[PDB]
């Protein structure tokens, strides 16, 4: 009909309102800032025991327990301090993309190409670990799982839909479908009232759990989007794409606040995370190195370069006192 | 230096031993993909071997444990999960010779992407040709020029089969570090599993020699 003509008028009108917002530039804003320095870290506790490619990791809220999933089919819960293992979980499916850890540290979530999300229970009267609830309902592979609390979980799948589940009843309560690509990562708000998720459609979307409907979109990339994470202030997030670049987004302004690139980097980005102060935008690329970049100074400085294969995942302790990154090398390296 | 940490360390060592045993049991097996265009008879192929999301089948033959992963339910961009199978031994690729009535060259396009993909630069491809009886019956009437204009040859079973095989083979670009094993089969054959076994043992020998540095 004539809606596409109207859609062009609205899409053109979108860019107009975007243009008038940039009252200044990040260069003007950050004119009074001391550069951080050539920050470097060293590997100090190397976890080993995985026999295949590692894909995902997540620190617990104790800042002491981390869970990692590999293609060997094993879910290992490490005691980070003594590098000894606490539990080892056999998985039904050996293809895993993401893992998660409950805020209460009593539950574990796994998922992969089997496009089923499974919750595992740790603290039991019996000694071992059993499967509590299995989440069926997606048509495409799960890419990222996160917990709101002990009763709720958000998943993202290749169906290009995100869902939210009540664990006790085991049925969805909200679908997020305005997207058009292939969703890759989720990040919850610090107050857990909203979340954001990029996809192969080169567009980032932010949603709202209560109403279950998209409220923001961005157009800032020429290829697939791989990972997202909230700025610890709950008013921004960062995007890492296949095109060797990262860009930051501010929600109250709805524009690309900053970018970070280089000429030598040509490989993509696999995972992204922030620190407690929000100064460091830690990201692991595909060229066997994990770069460290400051999302305000706009000059990546830290070359975290210990691994032997591509870096796949990285997380930051809730007290902001370390950083762990697993890679296809089958090792987990914790920096501090 | 330990009070309950002695119990912690033994727990860790016991489960590490368990992990090594499970990993050796995993490494004992050989892994194969299974791709197709949907209309391809991958269902008949899996039915030939005796016995939602990703479906896996186990079978053994002459004391060799085979695991096969069948994708095809995922109606998404393949490039994001095609790298998970970056260490499989071989790839089974099926096309239908009765490809003169589809909505064809689409499977050739599928073959081109999979045979030049950067993850499989040194992974062998087993090319199964299916529906040979129906192909002969159909080609007895339909023309080979309907699909291939540049073709020039007899309307004969052997000539058409050889031409199709040649067009599939020359799509390979890295024949120095690659091999395509071709086979004509149908819904009544029984030597397809033995052909798979021969190809797989050849790939195993090749990989062992490449580890030993003699190849």
């Amino acid at each position, epitope marked *: 009909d004539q809606l596409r003509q109207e859609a062009e008028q609205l899409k053109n009108q979108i860019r107009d309102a975007r243009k008038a917002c940039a009252d200044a530039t990040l260069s003007q804003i950050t004119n009074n800032i001391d550069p951080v320095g050539r920050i470097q870290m060293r590997t100090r506790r190397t976890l080993r025991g995985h026999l295949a490619k590692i894909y995902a990791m997540h620190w617990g809220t104790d800042s*002491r327990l981390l869970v990692s999933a590999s293609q060997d089919g094993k879910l290992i819960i490490w*005691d980070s301090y*003594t590098t*000894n293992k*606490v539990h080892a979980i056999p998985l039904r499916s050996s293809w895993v993309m993401t893992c998660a850890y409950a805020p209460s540290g009593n539950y574990v979530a796994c998922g992969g190409l089997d496009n089923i999300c499974s919750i595992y229970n740790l603290k039991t*009267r*019996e*000694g*071992n670990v059993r499967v509590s609830r299995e989440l069926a309902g997606h048509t495409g592979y799960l890419s990222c799982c996160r917990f709101l609390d002990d009763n709720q979980i958000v998943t993202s799948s290749g169906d290009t839909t995100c869902a939210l589940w009540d664990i006790e009843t085991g049925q969805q309560t909200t679908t997020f479908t305005g997207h058009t690509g292939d969703v890759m990562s989720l990040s919850l708000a610090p107050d857990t009232r909203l979340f954001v998720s990029g996809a192969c459609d080169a567009s980032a979307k932010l949603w709202d759990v209560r109403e279950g409907m998209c409220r923001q979109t961005f157009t800032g990339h020429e290829s697939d989007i791989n990972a997202i994470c909230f700025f610890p202030n709950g008013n921004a997030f960062a995007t890492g794409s296949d095109d060797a670049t990262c860009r930051l987004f501010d929600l109250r302004a709805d524009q690309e606040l900053m970018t970070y690139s280089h000429d030598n980097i040509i490989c993509g980005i696999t995972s992204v995370s922030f620190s407690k102060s929000g100064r460091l935008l830690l990201a692991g690329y595909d060229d066997f190195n994990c770069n460290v970049w400051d999302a305000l100074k706009a000059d990546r400085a830290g070359v975290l370069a210990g691994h032997d294969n591509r870096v796949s995942c990285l997380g930051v302790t809730d007290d902001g006192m370390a950083v762990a990154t697993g890679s296809w090398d089958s090792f987990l390296k914790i920096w501090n | 230096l330990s*009070a*309950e*940490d*002695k*119990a*912690a360390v*033994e*727990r860790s*060592k*016991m489960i590490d031993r368990n992990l090594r045993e499970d990993g050796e049991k995993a490494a004992r097996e050989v892994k194969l993909l299974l791709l197709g265009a949907g209309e391809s008879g991958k269902s008949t192929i899996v039915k030939q071997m005796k016995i939602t999301g990703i479906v896996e089948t186990h079978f053994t033959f002459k004391d060799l444990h085979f695991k096969m992963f069948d994708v095809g339910g995922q109606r998404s961009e393949r490039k994001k999960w095609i790298h998970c199978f970056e260490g499989v031994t071989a790839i089974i690729f099926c096309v239908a010779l009765s490809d003169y009535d589809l909505v064809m060259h689409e499977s050739m396009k599928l073959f081109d992407s999979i045979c030049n993909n950067k993850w499989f630069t040194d992974t062998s491809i087993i090319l199964f040709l299916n529906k040979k009886d129906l192909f002969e019956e159909k080609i007895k009437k339909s023309p080979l020029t309907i699909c291939y204009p540049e073709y020039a040859g007899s309307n004969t079973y052997e000539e058409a089969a050889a031409y199709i095989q040649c067009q599939f083979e020359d799509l390979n670009k890295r024949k120095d570090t690659k091999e395509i094993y071709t086979h004509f089969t149908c819904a009544t054959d029984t030597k397809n599993v033995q052909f798979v076994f021969d190809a797989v043992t050849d790939v195993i020998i090749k990989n062992n020699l490449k580890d030993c540095g003699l190849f």
Partner: single-chain antibody
Amino acid sequence: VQLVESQPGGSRKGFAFSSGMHWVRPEKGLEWVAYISSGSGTIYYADTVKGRFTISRDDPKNTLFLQMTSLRSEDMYYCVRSIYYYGSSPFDFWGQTTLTVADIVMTQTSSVPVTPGESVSISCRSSKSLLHSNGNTYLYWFLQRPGQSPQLLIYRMSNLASGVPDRFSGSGSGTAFTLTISRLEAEDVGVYYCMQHLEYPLTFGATKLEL
């Protein structure tokens, strides 16, 4: 969840079993005797009976044998399980069983009367310190009603356990240790105990808290 324990000089002898499991010790006090480390890796015995009391486990059989021999006059006994790892609750489940014939010390106080509702507090005395370098302090409390079994009410003097109403508490400082109950109920009467777990010989305590 289920652990039922089944002539001087003589001799005599659920849930996930494959993963310590200790033994414990007549109108008198109660103390540790002997134990296991899961997986039969490391074994320690009692320094007071070392030589004539044997221990043995059979995971596929799912049993437990304590071969005691050459009975001295220093002779109830009970079986206990302790699935041990970080953040675990060892000794969390005891059972019931009497056979009538240079280290740390854990000396409690004899008794004290109370009334329901009135707050009650307990203290204890140790020999050396218990704050190991790793970061935590090892001591377990055990209520024991008459005609009943001791329970792991508190472990590591800060953490409650399953089934524990959260009116208890705990604290410690060097050697001085405490324990408090806010609102004593009809099911809060019986002798207490203790156990230090830093040096493996587990010196227990003697408090028959009458109403």
